Paper text:
Calpain-I and calpain-II are the two most studied members of a family of calcium dependent cysteine proteases that currently comprises fifteen identified gene products in humans. These heterodimeric proteases are composed of a large subunit with a molecular mass of ∼80 000 and a small subunit of mass ∼30 000. Selective inhibitors might not only be potential drugs but should act as tools to explore the physiological and pathophysiological roles of calpain-I. α-Mercaptoacrylic acid based calpain inhibitors are potent, cell permeable and selective inhibitors of calpain-I and calpain-II. These inhibitors target the calcium binding domain [name](S) of calpain-I and -II.
To test this proposal, the oxidised form of 3, (2Z,2′Z)-2,2′-disulfanediylbis(3-(6-bromoindol-3-yl)acrylic acid), (4), was generated and the single crystal X-ray structure of 4 bound to [name](S) solved. Compound 4 was then added to preformed crystals of [name](S). The electron density map revealed that the ligand adopts two different conformations in each subunit of the [name](S) homodimer, therefore a total of four conformations of the ligand were observed in the asymmetric unit of the crystal structure. The unique geometry of the disulfide bond is observed in all of the conformations ensuring that both pockets of the hydrophobic groove of [name](S) are explored. One of the 6-bromoindole rings of 4 is bound in the hydrophobic binding pocket that also binds 3. The second indole ring of 4 interacts with a hydrophobic groove on the surface of [name](S), where the α-helix of CAST inhibitory region C binds with [name](S). A greater number of interactions form between 4 and residues of [name](S) than with 3 and the protein, including a number of electrostatic interactions and hydrogen bonds. An electrostatic bond forms between the carboxylate group of 4 and the positively charged guanidinium group of Arg130. The dihedral angle of –91 in chain A is close to the optimum dihedral angle and in this conformation 4 makes strong interactions with both hydrophobic pockets of [name](S). The restricted geometry of the disulphide bond facilitated a larger number of favourable binding interactions with [name](S) so that the two aromatic rings of 4 interact with the hydrophobic pockets that bind Leu 660 and Leu 656 of calpastatin.
Author numbering:
A (entry chain B), B (entry chain A): 96 to 268
Write the structure that this text describes.
Amino acid sequence: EEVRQFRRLFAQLAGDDMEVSATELMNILNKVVTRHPDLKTDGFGIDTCRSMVAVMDSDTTGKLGFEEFKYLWNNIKRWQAIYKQFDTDRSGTICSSELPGAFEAAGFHLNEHLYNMIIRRYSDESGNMDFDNFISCLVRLDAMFRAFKSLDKDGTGQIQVNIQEWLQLTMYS
Amino acid sequence: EEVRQFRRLFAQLAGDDMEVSATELMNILNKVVTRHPDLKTDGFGIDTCRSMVAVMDSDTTGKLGFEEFKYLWNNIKRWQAIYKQFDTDRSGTICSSELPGAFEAAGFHLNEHLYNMIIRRYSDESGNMDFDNFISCLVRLDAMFRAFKSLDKDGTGQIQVNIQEWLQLTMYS
Ligand SMILES: O=C(O)/C(=C/c1c[nH]c2cc(Br)ccc12)SS/C(=C\c1c[nH]c2cc(Br)ccc12)C(=O)O
Ligand SMILES: O=C(O)/C(=C/c1c[nH]c2cc(Br)ccc12)SS/C(=C\c1c[nH]c2cc(Br)ccc12)C(=O)O
Ligand SMILES: [Ca+2]
Ligand SMILES: [Ca+2]
Ligand SMILES: [Ca+2]
Ligand SMILES: [Ca+2]
Ligand SMILES: [Ca+2]
Ligand SMILES: [Ca+2]
Ligand SMILES: [Ca+2]
Ligand SMILES: [Ca+2]
């Protein structure tokens, strides 16, 4: 049903090597947002898309297999709905006061300091975040929570990170 | 003298707020790299410059002050010299086989696994890395080593962090 449409989508996007490259992902995300005039964006750039692919590429093939792509695509589908719901002035962007509500709706309850850091890193000079920056941020945030969770086997809220794992987790992202 | 020139050029670049934004940095790196055609590039994009600024913004103003800028600039100047030196076929690009000499000359000794990841994230389908990607990689890799070492004064090879700390450390595009 939806399982067959999705499988078709992935097959046609992934093409001859049966995995989704950064460039394939970039072209599809740009194709789709082009149809949503309520999402303001200067575009999905290659560098951003290589970042998204690396962070999602948990088997280190270089590209996104079916499950990796499914996980990402379904996140974006939920996250775009959130963005539109929380763009309560229809600017096409998420401003500083809209951001906490949006991230919280996505399951990320941060604190003022962390929201300010993300606005600082991801939002523009007026404190507005456009749609590709918003998705780029959430992919990584979601990945970073997941990485923490894997390392926190005993549920102490502290993790021990060796230098090798640190370099992999930050450089292959 | 060189010191006076550097201060003038920074003052001119930083303008009214006396700090260098990601957009200001993008513009000057694109203007300078165009004068060095041996450094082949598809350009410095805004996302890559926002990341550089973020990783260099140690007083969290959101932009690079004089000392933060100088430090990034001096690294870029050393690193461009290494890129030219280790580009032995003169392709304007750093191939997989040229990369470790270059990283070794920058002071970094990474295992094969980490090279594979960096090559997948930053080089093309032929294993060639262009100049903006080489610089983006090195600015990040340096910053990540420096971050880890700051938190591991004793050289245990490990750091311990909570979720807040982990997010502050990693939430870098
Ligand atoms: O449920 C799904 O898989 C959907 C996929 C989808 C929607 N439009 C598409 C266009 C192409 Br060319 C392929 C696949 C498409 S419909 S949900 C939706 C918005 C939505 C879903 N993913 C999005 C990504 C981006 Br970038 C922008 C908008 C997206 C809606 O109902 O509006
Ligand atoms: O060759 C040039 O264009 C140089 C420009 C230059 C020197 N000092 C500058 C200060 C600012 Br705020 C802007 C431009 C300046 S002199 S060579 C140099 C560094 C260097 C060499 N190649 C480079 C490429 C890129 Br992209 C960035 C810097 C590069 C230097 O003297 O530091
Ligand atoms: Ca493919
Ligand atoms: Ca993969
Ligand atoms: Ca808004
Ligand atoms: Ca954007
Ligand atoms: Ca400025
Ligand atoms: Ca600063
Ligand atoms: Ca070469
Ligand atoms: Ca490039």
